[PDB]
């Protein structure tokens, strides 16, 4: 049988040009009044998955 | 089957 993609991981990571994965930063869903604006601004843009996690991410997405 | 001194309780439970 074909390998099955982990669908939650497919919804949360997209692949980039050189083979990395981009993801959205955590901690920007609520409690935003007491979070500071500098912290929220730096949490706003998308980021890259690190070296400690690329292995798990690729193992969850065989078809990306 | 099994030995009666293994089925018994006073000698099997000898060191509780």
């Amino acid at each position: 049988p074909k390998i099955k993609t982990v669908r939650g991981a497919a919804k949360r990571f997209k692949k980039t040009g050189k083979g990395g994965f981009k993801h959205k930063h955590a901690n920007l869903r609520h409690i935003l009044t007491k979070k500071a604006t500098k912290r929220k601004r730096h949490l706003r843009p998308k980021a890259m998955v690190s070296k400690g996690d690329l292995g798990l991410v690729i193992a969850c997405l065989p078809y990306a | 089957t099994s030995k009666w001194f293994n089925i018994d309780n006073k000698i099997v439970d000898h060191r509780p």
Partner: protein, 144 residues
């Protein structure tokens, strides 16, 4: 050249691991699994993305975005394909007939990649700035 004078190339036929066949093979007894534990059990192991009970990365990060069916049905076209099309007139159905794009792509675009040296007419496709300059330099025509 007989049936018993043919041999494969060097290094092309490395033989597989044979686990558990004595001390000297280096894979005897446990066979590369260590001592005890879930990973040496037969059929043992964890699933993908398991981190020992800590919340996995694909569940502590937030989801984002949505999916566009227009992006699913739109393709992009190289200038090399633009030259490879047959007939000298570049339309959606001509590209489909020349197998540049599949049958369900409705919108197409020509991008600056490769090079064009044959004067061709583009009709009914969006064209980027660099591709328009390259086609007009090569001596073509861009319709609307």
């Amino acid at each position: 050249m007989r049936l018993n004078t043919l041999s494969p190339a060097e290094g092309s036929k490395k033989a597989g691991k044979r686990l558990g066949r004595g001390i000297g093979s280096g894979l005897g007894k446990t066979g590369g699994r260590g001592h005890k534990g879930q990973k040496s059990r037969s059929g043992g192991g964890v699933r993908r993305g398991f981190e020992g009970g800590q919340m996995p990365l694909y569940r502590r990060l937030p989801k984002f975005g949505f999916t566009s069916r227009k992006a699913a049905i739109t393709a992009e076209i190289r200038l090399s394909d633009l030259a490879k099309v047959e007939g000298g007139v570049v339309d959606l159905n001509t590209l489909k007939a020349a197998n540049i794009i599949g049958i369900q792509i409705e919108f197409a675009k020509v991008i600056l990649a490769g090079e064009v040296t044959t004067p061709v007419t583009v009709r009914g496709l969006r064209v980027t700035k660099g591709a328009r300059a390259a086609i007009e330099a090569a001596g073509g025509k861009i319709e609307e």
